C-alpha cells in the first residue's frame, strides 16, 4: 500500500491520482471510442504526466542525492512509457479495420497501464525521500 502522509499539500500525490484517473478513462473507453478519439484520451494522460513531472522537478532540489537518482530514474522511464503509449495509439489508429486492429488496442491498454504503475512507484520513492529528508508530516 502507500504511505499515510498529509496529502493536502502533496501536489505530487494529486498529480498521481489525476494521471491514474486519465489512465482509467482510457481503459474503459477504448472499446467505445473511434480512432480520432484516441488522441484525446492519450493527450490527457500526457498532460497529467507533465503536470506530475513538473511538481517532482520542483521538489528534486530539497531532497537526498541517492533518491534524486531513482526518482530521475523513473522520470526517464515515464517518458519512455508515454513514447510507447503514443506509438501504440498511432498504430491502433492506422490499424483500425486490419488484422491487428484489436491487438494494437491491447498494446495501448498495456502501455497506459504500465505508465500508471510507474507513476505510483514514482510517488512511493517521493514519499520515502520526503521522510528520509525530515520533510514529511502525518495525515492532518
Amino acid at each position: 500500500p502507500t504511505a499515510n502522509l498529509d496529502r493536502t499539500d502533496d501536489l505530487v500525490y494529486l498529480n498521481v491520482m489525476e494521471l491514474v484517473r486519465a489512465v482509467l478513462e482510457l481503459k474503459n473507453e477504448l472499446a467505445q471510442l473511434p480512432p480520432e478519439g484516441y488522441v484525446v484520451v492519450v493527450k490527457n494522460v500526457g498532460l497529467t504526466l507533465r503536470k506530475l513531472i513538473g511538481s517532482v522537478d520542483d521538489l528534486l532540489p530539497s531532497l537526498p542525492s541517492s533518491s534524486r537518482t531513482e526518482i530521475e530514474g523513473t522520470q526517464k522511464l515515464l517518458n519512455k512509457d508515454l513514447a510507447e503509449l503514443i506509438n501504440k495509439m498511432r498504430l491502433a489508429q492506422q490499424n483500425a479495420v486490419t488484422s491487428l486492429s484489436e491487438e494494437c488496442k491491447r498494446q495501448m491498454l498495456t502501455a497506459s497501464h504500465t505508465l500508471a504503475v510507474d507513476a505510483k512507484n514514482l510517488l512511493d520513492a517521493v514519499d520515502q525521500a520526503k521522510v528520509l529528508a525530515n520533510l514529511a508530516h502525518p495525515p492532518a
Partner: peptide, 11 residues
C-alpha cells in the same frame, strides 16, 4: 492512501 483502492481498481 486511498489511491491504493484507486490502484487495485486498475487491477
Amino acid at each position: 492512501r486511498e489511491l491504493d483502492e484507486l490502484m487495485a481498481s486498475l487491477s
